[PDB]
Write a protein that binds this ligand. Structure first.
Ligand code: MG
Ligand code: ZN
Ligand code: ZN
Lengths: 1343, 50, 79, 49
DNA sequence: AACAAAATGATTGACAAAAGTGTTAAATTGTGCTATAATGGGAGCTGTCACGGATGCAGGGGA
DNA sequence: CCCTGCATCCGTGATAGACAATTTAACACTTTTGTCAATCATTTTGTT
């Protein structure tokens, strides 16, 4: 079939459903029961769906090859292939109409809102329970009044004509058939303008948008009421005979027999003329059988006969099995087996058993045995391979010369889960596999199997060698860090090879190069790690790619020299001179990539594996039961905290201390003893050996074989050594609460029964999560890769000058991420210079690779403006420069690469392992620098302090180079120390605040005015004399009682004459609202000073177990859910002012410098009456949702909020993921825009942003402007529904609702995507197939 | 007759095997101490002593 | 034999038409079109295609001029 | 099962992950060789031909 | 130095020989009957949870 | 006399005994292949 495109879908008219079918199916019977030939006119006909046996009629009069087109006259079978029995269709002719259960019961009833009829009334008519009028004329009845059985009968006696009432499914065909979509279209174009109701004129534009679909589409309205139901072909609902006599029917021949039977009877009752109590019960019974066929389940669930499970209708066949019915494909040429190790292989080859390779490559082998003349014909070659003759074992080896195969493990998380390999024939039945690659598949060798495929064609074994080969992927795509780090056993081999004892065999002697250092150790004189002086010539590339020798006398061991003979030329000797753990090997490969490229690094990543495995076998690194040394002071450390806690339980015995301060005091006394065991153990493993020189004794690092496996990073660390020797922590019972007594014995001494039943719990919550975190993170990456599906680099450069700023994250006194590692591999929108003006060092937009960073590391820039993929100007994709640099490779991102799907897997492949002193008194920083604060309005007071006003006081501790070091926040109750430009001491507070209290400090003093804090109305009358305390709580907005609710609490500071003293730098006098939880000590009668604390607002923060997060936060963050307590914002920067209050909730005003917006009563506001607010600034408190951020602050504002939270769930777990990947999902998450003005769109619709920018760049480009929009933001589950296609939505989302809505409008899916383009089975438009799509769009609309 | 790996005990905390591997060696130490005594056919007075 | 096409991308800097360029030249040596330019060393037809591209003997431009002459070169047979 | 003299040490990478090495004295003596007993059934139905 | 003759392909119809289009008898298939008194109603179920979008009441707030 | 506010609800995830018209399968055979022999040419061992 020709190069089609644009699958088109729309309703089907009864004159078309009669055009697919080849005949009318008019009986219920299927086959004959005696001779199993199918009957005539039944369901399985032969005159209708073609013949049964290939090329022969049914009776048996036409078998010869002469009669090949004729239709038999006995039984009118057409003598053709039995394949045509698979693509013909019948049709049943309904004796009465019946509603289409999709277009009647889908939640927005398409029959409903096309008539403006409540769905509970249509259902009262389709059951023949209530008449409905048609064409009332001049009487007291509208067109759609619902006359009950009496009211019509009480109406029918008066009028006989000019009036027509119907009932049942044949009525809705009357309402629709006469309704006209043009009269009520324009007539509703006026009715929408008169209506003034935010609900009325919002749904009103919903109906008028449906009527506007049933006209241009070309679908009449009355086609949603069936009149000829078409039947499937009889080979997609087979009746195959099982072995032994039983048949295995599909579950549709049970449903079709139930419609043709009931429809066949209803044909009879109209000829026998039964009363209207029965035939009216027939149509009601038929219509339930047609709707049990389309989508069975939205009714009484007509369960199967002869069995007790529900039948499976048609719409329960497309409906998700978690995915599509077509391709979202089991596959030939495959296999699977148990993987094993095989550490003699190169990096780019895997074993493959003789018994398998002789079975996958069979059709290739048949080629040789008939090409070399060894077999005469193909049948004689099938018997030479079955015997396993000794010739085929030498022909099969030439078929596997360079034929890469594809190994792939089962739960393929990321793109490195599939890699090709060049096979090598071994003997056995286990697919060997190079040990370096087993950390990409995440494959332990304890029974994990691995399929293998075979690329057949000639373009498919180059894509398995250029793109997919195993020596191309040494950099993981999620981040530039390597993925072929020598993992577990080799890393202990090298650590043992490059340590140093203190006095070993042959110390102090001087060698003469790597070659003498090796053989000196082989012969047996010098020890593998003994301090020695060698001479080593290192190279160094300093000119335009040339090497220069430099011979010297390095001071090293014998072990490091032997390892120097492996390192290629360009590297320096300070790379193998350390102790060489696991963090140092991983970089020793990285520097060999950035310098010497990929030809040597793939052959240097193997010489490590051959050297690590070798020198670990001579190590004899075994583990015993005396390796794990128990500390000797473990008893005293345990008995003291044993008795010390026995004497706090007494303090609760004699009622001194409450229990809550009994519990937490016992927890923190064990944590002291739990930490004095680790510190008493690790200091006994680390400095274990004390060996001697020729003279005295001197200690070193140990050689304890259970410490070496912890310090190399080979396997496990001190969080587990602490349980084999130290004390085994304290456990939590099922609530989440800690038990009072910790399990006080390790895994070297036993654990008695009660200590084991306690530990047995945590191994259950451990397994019941890893069993669940896979099922849960397997649905978070299935949605990300279905919204970000259709995105592809589709242009070489965009041109836009709008980027973002990449400031390093600042974690109070610590930096979470350096500025360099955030901006590596990116373009630069505006060329930054030195901080001195006109010092343009980095040019106009250029890649920031490994040098231009460090060049900006030498200089002192504090931020750069880079181009982000959330701001590119391209249509349908992103340009190359906007995206950036990253790849498995190092180049810029090649045009055509599919960045959509490699971005949704980098965010979903983690999570599987990321499942989930608290004092806060003094602001103590490690630094000393000038303090530059912004967004602050503070004043020095008479206390000798810059008075605090709000929580906009961040403390930017500027370093010596024009940067930022630390960020803080200064709330009320915070006394300041220094000024501006004057530093703060080492670990000193420039500002101190009350942790246990959020007080209000006195700006101005004076007498006190009882402003809505009167006794009884705000707090009951309590007396407290000159001491200056009380028990009076000034409750806040959501902590106030019921009685005196006409008050807002604040005590008016007054001046020396009696006036309300004002706030310096504003308009309002001092009315300092004392916040909640305030036991106000300040009662009138006593004079205070300016600069006193007005009320306590306690804040303990003891325990710190009051935070959200985990995996659901990453899913709850992308979906953009409104978090139940949002923070208000300022829609326009103007003047603050209030209005009428106590409408059940407060109110407010905003005006330019009117805008009126309310406010509920629960929130302590963060604004004053006289205030000039900034647009979109916090007016209340609450975790603001992403919708409010985009509507106010901008597109870069919602991006920098999402990218900073989702990056805050990973980095606290140690997972590296580049934040380029969370921006090609915040781009694909807000591509829908709603219009403001008009000129081409109807002023309130919702259209894709690409549309509004291809008219506006077109209409406004022409000689007349003739619109304005507003970006929107929707979750990943609702944004993958509103795509332009209807296959990329019906594939993964709810399917019943995406075919219904698409069929009504008559969509046309143009196949410009990936998941809509793999279904049909052709070249996906991104990758090797993107090239040929360059030629297909360049062919239509031209020659 | 087998060569297991010692990088399985530090992470997976099963110290059972490293203890059963010793007591499994003392038991088979008596095995070769009796199999020699019984092979010189010393006496039924020496066996009952050991 | 070939283990890495890192060298054969230095000519064609794309990595996505190095497949297309060499999957088409690799067919001319299989279906009876031509013979290899470089000397073969008992290798298949894909590896010999990826070994010419490294030597500059082949690219997306040469294969057009190299074969567009055939019509003119057949034009003598085209009369 | 059987009980056989075991040693804890990394041997040349042939026991990289949790995998195991095995001497050939454990295959000669035939101490891990198990026996399996399948079954095959051939029914001869009564067709209509 | 050319055919003595002796078949031998090539060559005719003829006994045979098997096997495919219309009569009888057996079976299968089905059609219409059958007159105590019978009159609502048989009929299964459960230990999910969370998010989202309507359809409805509700009664607070504005002419 | 008119809009905003909870709240219930539903969906999509994860009790036997004559009629007749009917169909196969059977026995029956004509054309189509298989012999199955005698003339029409192509020669037929080495004497005429
Ligand atoms: Mg495993
Ligand atoms: Zn027929
Ligand atoms: Zn761009």
């Amino acid at each position: 079939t020709e190069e089609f495109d644009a699958i088109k879908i729309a309703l089907a008219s009864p004159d078309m459903i009669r055009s697919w079918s080849f005949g009318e199916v008019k009986k219920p019977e299927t086959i004959n029961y005696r001779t199993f030939k199918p009957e005539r006119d039944g369901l399985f006909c032969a005159r209708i769906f073609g013949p049964v046996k290939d090329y022969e009629c049914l009776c048996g009069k036409y078998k010869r090859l002469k009669h090949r087109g004729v239709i038999c006259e006995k039984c009118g079978v057409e003598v053709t292939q039995t394949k045509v029995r698979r693509e013909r269709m019948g049709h049943i002719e309904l004796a009465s109409p019946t509603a289409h259960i999709w277009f009647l019961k889908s939640l927005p009833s398409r029959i409903g809102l096309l008539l403006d009829m409540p769905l509970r009334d249509i259902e009262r008519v389709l059951y023949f329970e209530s008449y409905v009028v048609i064409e009332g004329g001049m009487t007291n009845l509208e067109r759609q009044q619902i006359l009950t059985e009496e009211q019509y009968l009480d109406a029918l006696e008066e009028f006989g004509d000019e009036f027509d009432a119907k009932m049942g499914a044949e009525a809705i065909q009357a309402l629709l058939k006469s309704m006209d979509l043009e009269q009520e279209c324009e007539q509703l174009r006026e009715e929408l303008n008169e209506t003034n109701s935010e609900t009325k004129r919002k749904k009103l534009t919903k109906r008028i948008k449906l009527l506007e679909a049933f006209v241009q589409s070309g679908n009449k309205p009355e086609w949603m009421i069936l009149t000829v139901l078409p039947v499937l072909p009889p080979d997609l609902r087979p009746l195959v005979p099982l072995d032994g006599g039983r048949f295995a029917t599909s579950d549709l021949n049970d449903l079709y027999r139930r419609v043709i039977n009931r429809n066949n009877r209803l044909k009879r009752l109209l000829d026998l003329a039964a009363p209207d109590i029965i035939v009216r019960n027939e149509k009601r019974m038929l219509q339930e059988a047609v709707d049990a066929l389309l989508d069975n389940g939205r009714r009484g669930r007509a369960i199967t006969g002869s069995n007790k499970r529900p039948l499976k209708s048609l719409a329960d066949m497309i409906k998700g099995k978690q995915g599509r019915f077509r391709q979202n494909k089991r596959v030939d040429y495959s296999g699977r087996s148990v993987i094993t190790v095989g550490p003699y292989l190169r990096l780019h080859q895997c074993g493959l058993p003789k018994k398998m390779a002789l079975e996958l490559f069979k059709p290739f082998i048949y080629g040789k045995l008939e090409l070399r003349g060894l077999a005469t014909t193909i049948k004689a070659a099938k018997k030479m391979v079955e015997r396993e003759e000794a010739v085929v074992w030498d022909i099969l080896d030439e078929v596997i010369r360079e034929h890469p195969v594809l190994l792939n493990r089962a739960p393929t998380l990321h793109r490195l889960g599939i890699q090709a390999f060049e096979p090598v024939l071994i003997e056995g039945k286990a697919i060997q596999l190079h040990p370096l690659v087993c950390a990409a598949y995440n494959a332990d060798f304890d029974g994990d199997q691995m399929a293998v495929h075979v690329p057949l064609t000639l373009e498919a074994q180059l894509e398995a060698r250029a793109l997919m080969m195993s020596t191309n992927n040494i950099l993981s795509p999620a981040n530039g860090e390597p993925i072929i780090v020598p993992s577990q056993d080799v890393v202990l081999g090298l650590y043992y090879m490059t340590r140093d004892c203190v006095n070993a065999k042959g110390e102090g002697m001087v060698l003469t190069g790597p070659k003498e250092a090796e053989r000196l150790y082989r012969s047996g004189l010098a020890s593998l790690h003994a301090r020695v002086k060698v001479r080593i010539t290192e190279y160094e590339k300093d000119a335009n790619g040339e090497l220069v020798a430099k011979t010297s006398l390095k001071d090293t061991t014998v072990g490091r020299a032997i390892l120097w003979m492996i390192v290629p030329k360009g590297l320096p000797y300070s790379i193998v001179n350390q102790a060489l753990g696991k963090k140092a090997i991983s970089k020793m490969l990285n520097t060999c990539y950035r310098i010497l490229g990929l030809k040597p690094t793939v052959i240097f990543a193997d010489q490590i594996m051959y050297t690590g495995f070798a020198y670990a076998a001579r190590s004899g690194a075994s583990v015993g039961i005396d390796d794990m040394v128990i500390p000797e002071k473990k008893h005293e450390i345990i008995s003291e905290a044993e008795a010390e806690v026995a004497e706090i339980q007494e303090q609760f015995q004699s009622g001194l201390v409450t229990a809550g301060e009994r519990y937490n005091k016992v927890i923190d006394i064990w944590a002291a003893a739990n930490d004095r065991v680790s510190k008493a153990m690790m200091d006994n493993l680390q400095t274990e050996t004390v060996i001697n020189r020729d003279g005295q004794e001197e200690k070193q690092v140990s050689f304890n074989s259970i410490y070496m496996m912890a310090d190399s990073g080979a396997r496990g660390s001190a969080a587990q050594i602490r349980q084999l020797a130290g004390m085994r922590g304290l456990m939590a019972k099922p609530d989440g609460s800690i038990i009072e007594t910790p399990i006080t014995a390790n895994f070297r001494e036993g654990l008695n029964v009660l200590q084991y039943f306690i530990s047995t719990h945590g191994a259950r919550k451990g397994l019941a999560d890893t069993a669940l975190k896979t099922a849960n993170s397997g649905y978070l990456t299935r949605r990300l890769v279905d919204v970000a599906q259709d995105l592809v680099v589709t242009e070489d450069d965009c041109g836009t000058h709008e980027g973002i700023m990449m400031t390093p994250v600042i974690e109070g006194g610590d930096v979470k991420e350096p500025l360099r590692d955030r901006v590596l591999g990116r373009v630069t929108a505006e060329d930054v210079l030195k901080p001195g003006t006109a010092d343009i060092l980095v040019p106009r937009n250029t890649l920031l690779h490994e040098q231009w960073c460090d060049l900006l590391e030498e200089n002192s820039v504090d931020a750069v403006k880079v181009r982000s993929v959330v701001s590119c100007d391209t249509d349908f994709g992103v340009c190359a420069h906007c995206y950036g640099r990253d790849l498995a490779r190092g180049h810029i991102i090649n045009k055509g690469e599919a960045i959509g799907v490699i971005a949704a897997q980098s965010i979903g492949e983690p999570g599987t392992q990321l499942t989930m002193a608290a004092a806060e008194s003094s602001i103590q920083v490690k630094n000393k620098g000038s303090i530059k604060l912004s967004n602050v309005k503070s004043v020095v007071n008479s206390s000798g302090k810059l008075v605090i006003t709000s929580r906009n006081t961040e403390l930017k501790l500027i370093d010596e180079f024009g940067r930022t070091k630390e960020s803080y926040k200064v709330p009320y109750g915070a006394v300041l120390a220094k000024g501006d430009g004057e530093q703060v001491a080492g670990g000193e507070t420039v500002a101190n605040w009350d942790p246990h209290t959020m007080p209000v400090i006195t700006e101005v003093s004076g007498f006190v005015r009882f402003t809505d804090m009167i006794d009884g109305q705000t707090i009951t009358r309590q007396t407290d004399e000159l001491t200056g305390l009380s028990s009076l709580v000034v409750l806040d907005s959501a902590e106030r009682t019921a009685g005196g609710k006409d008050l807002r609490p604040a005590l008016k500071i007054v001046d020396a004459q009696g006036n309300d003293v004002l706030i310096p730098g504003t308009d309002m006098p001092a009315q300092y609202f004392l916040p909640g939880k305030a036991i106000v000590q300040l009662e009138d009668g006593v004079q205070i000073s300016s600069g006193d604390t007005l009320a306590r607002i306690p804040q303990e923060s003891g325990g710190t177990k009051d935070i959200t997060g985990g995996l659901p936060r990453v899913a709850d963050l992308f979906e953009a859910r409104r978090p139940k307590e949002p923070a208000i914002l300022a829609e326009i920067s103007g003047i603050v002012s209030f209005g009428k209050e106590t409408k059940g909730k407060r109110r407010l005003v905003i005006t330019p410098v009117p805008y009126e917006e309310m406010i509920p009563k629960w929130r302590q506001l963060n604004v004053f009456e006289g205030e000039r607010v900034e647009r979109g600034d916090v007016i209340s408190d609450g975790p603001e949702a992403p919708h409010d951020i985009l509507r106010l602050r901008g597109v870069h504002a919602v991006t920098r909020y999402i990218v900073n939270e989702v990056q805050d769930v990973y980095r606290l777990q140690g997972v590296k993921i580049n934040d380029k990947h969370i921006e090609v999902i915040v781009r694909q998450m807000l591509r829908k825009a709603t219009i403001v003005n008009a000129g081409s769109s109807d002023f309130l619709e919702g259209e894709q942003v690409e549309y509004s920018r291809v008219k506006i760049a077109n209409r406004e480009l022409e000689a007349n402007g003739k619109a304005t929009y507003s970006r929107d933001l929707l979750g990943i589950t609702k944004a993958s529904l509103a795509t332009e296609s209807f296959i990329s939505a019906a594939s993964f989302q709810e399917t019943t609702r995406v075919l219904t809505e698409a069929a009504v409008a008559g969509k046309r899916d143009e196949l410009r995507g990936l998941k809509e383009n793999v279904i049909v089975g052709r070249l996906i438009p991104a990758g090797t197939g993107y090239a040929y799509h360059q030629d297909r769009m360049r062919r239509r609309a031209a020659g | 007759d087998i060569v297991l790996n010692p990088l399985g005990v530090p992470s997976r905390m099963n110290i059972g095997q490293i203890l059963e591997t010793h007591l499994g060696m003392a038991a088979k130490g008596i095995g070769d101490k009796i199999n020699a005594m019984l092979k010189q056919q010393q006496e039924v007075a020496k066996l009952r002593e050991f | 034999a070939r283990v890495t096409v890192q060298d054969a991308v230095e000519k064609i800097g794309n990595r996505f038409d190095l497949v297309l360029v060499a999957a088409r030249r690799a067919r001319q040596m299989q279906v009876g079109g031509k013979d290899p330019l470089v000397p073969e060393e008992n290798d298949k037809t894909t590896v010999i295609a990826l070994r010419e591209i490294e030597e500059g003997l082949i690219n997306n431009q040469i294969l057009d001029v190299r074969e567009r002459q055939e019509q003119q070169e057949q034009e003598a047979a085209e009369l | 099962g059987q009980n056989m003299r075991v040693a804890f040490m990394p041997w040349n990478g042939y026991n990289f992950e949790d995998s195991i090495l095995v001497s050939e004295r454990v295959v000669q003596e035939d101490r891990f060789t198990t026996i399996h007993i399948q079954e095959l059934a051939c029914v001869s139905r009564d067709t209509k031909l």
